[PDB]
């Protein structure tokens, strides 16, 4: 029955305006991707991954808009809105499903270049939906399990298991980062060693652009939330600075993902 942004208050205020502006424009971009790929556009097998990534970003950015408006309602007009603490569990489920969708997209590009005749012919057509519902289900499972052992789900919880599942989510996140780097490196090795007709500069820049956007925008909230708070053992004086700048980086990730994975790839027809 508390907000995670009222620990300091006056020092936190300008990242909340960044969180609100970036989160509304990312909600607009994810809403356009969700509307277009849900109804208007025709979906291939990669568009299932782009759609489920925009759904994860939509859930994460609307929950960041809610936790922004709770701080803004407490700061300006002074109303302590007690939005329930199981919203944090669905926010982390959205965050983990978004980062797993980024590693899935990178693995799918690596598989399309390394085994191209299998990917054109023998790949099953429902593999995207299967892999999406398993990664969403496992991210949801880790999220409800962590929020139930850390007390976000109906206020029962023991620490000694809460840190051992926060370490599990941190290990899963660095595993997703190493899967994205291994797939984006094997794809770049095959493209810069063994191509004949490809645009190599745009492909190289797009691949390491997704890698750096992952590493310096998606990942820092998960490292500062599931791992750094147990190992740094300081609760106030760094945490009021390193938490909302991490939320600004995560909202920048969830705002940049609809552009990079849908709009840049498809809407180059416009200009």
Ligand X SMILES: CNCCc1ccc(OC)c(Cc2cc(CCNC)cc(Cc3cc(CCNC)ccc3OC)c2OC)c1
Judged by beta carbon, residue 71 or residue 136, the one nearer ligand CLR is 136
Judged by beta carbon, residue 151 or residue 182, the one nearer ligand X is 151
- Pick one of 22, 94, 162, 176: the residue that binds ligand X (CB under 6 A): 162
Judged by beta carbon, residue 105 or residue 207, the one nearer ligand CLR is 105
Is 243 buried (19+), middle (13-18) or exposed (0-12) by CB count in 10 A?
A: buried
| Residue 133 binds which of ligand CLR, ligand X, none (CB < 5-8 A, kind-dependent) | ligand CLR
CB of 141 to ligand X, least distance (A): 16
* 95, 135, 215 from 128: Cα distances, Å: 19, 11, 24
With b for 16 or more beta-carbon neighbours within 10 A and e for fewer, the 70-98 pattern comes to: bbbebbeeeeeeeeebeebbbbbbbbbbb
Strand residues in 16-154 grouped as ranges (E): none
The one-character DSSP state at 76 is T
Per DSSP, the chain holds a count of helices (H) and strands (E) of 11, 0
CB of 62 to ligand X, least distance (A): 20
| Residue 214 binds which of ligand CLR, ligand X, none (CB < 5-8 A, kind-dependent) | none
What token pair was written down for 131? 């892999």
CB of 56 to ligand CLR, least distance (A): 7
Residue 258 touches ligand CLR, criterion: CB under 6 A: no
Residue 164 touches ligand X, criterion: CB under 6 A: no
- Pick one of 52, 57, 166, 253: the residue that binds ligand X (CB under 6 A): 166
Residues that bind ligand CLR (CB under 6 A): 48, 51-52, 55, 129, 132-133, 136-137, 140
């Amino acid at each position: 029955d508390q907000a995670l942004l009222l620990l300091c208050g006056k020092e936190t205020l300008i990242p909340v305006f960044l969180i609100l502006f970036i989160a509304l424009v990312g909600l607009v971009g994810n809403g356009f991707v969700l509307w277009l790929l849900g109804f208007r556009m025709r979906r291939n097998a990669f568009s299932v991954y782009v759609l489920s990534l925009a759904g994860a970003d939509f859930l994460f950015l609307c929950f960041q808009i809610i936790n922004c408006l709770v701080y803004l309602s407490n700061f300006f007009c002074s109303i302590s809105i007690n939005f329930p603490s199981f919203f944090t569990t669905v926010m982390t489920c959205a965050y983990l499903a978004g980062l797993s969708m980024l590693s899935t997209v990178s693995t799918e590009r690596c598989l399309s270049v390394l085994w191209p005749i299998w990917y054109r012919c023998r790949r099953p057509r429902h593999l995207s939906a299967v892999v999406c519902v398993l990664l969403w289900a496992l991210s949801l499972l880790l999220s409800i399990l962590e929020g139930k052992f850390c007390g976000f789900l109906f206020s029962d919880g023991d620490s000694g298991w809460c840190q051992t599942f926060d370490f599990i989510t941190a290990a899963w996140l660095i595993f997703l980062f190493m899967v994205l780097c291994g797939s984006s490196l094997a794809l770049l090795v095959r493209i810069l060693c063994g191509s004949r007709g490809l645009p190599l500069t745009r492909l190289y820049l797009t691949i390491l652009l997704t890698v750096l956007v992952f590493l310096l925008c998606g990942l820092p909230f998960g490292i500062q939330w599931f791992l750094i708070l147990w190992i740094w053992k300081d609760s106030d004086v760094l945490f009021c600075h390193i938490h909302p700048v991490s939320v600004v980086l995560s909202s920048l990730n969830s705002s940049a993902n609809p552009i990079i994975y849908f709009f840049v790839g498809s809407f180059r027809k416009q200009w």
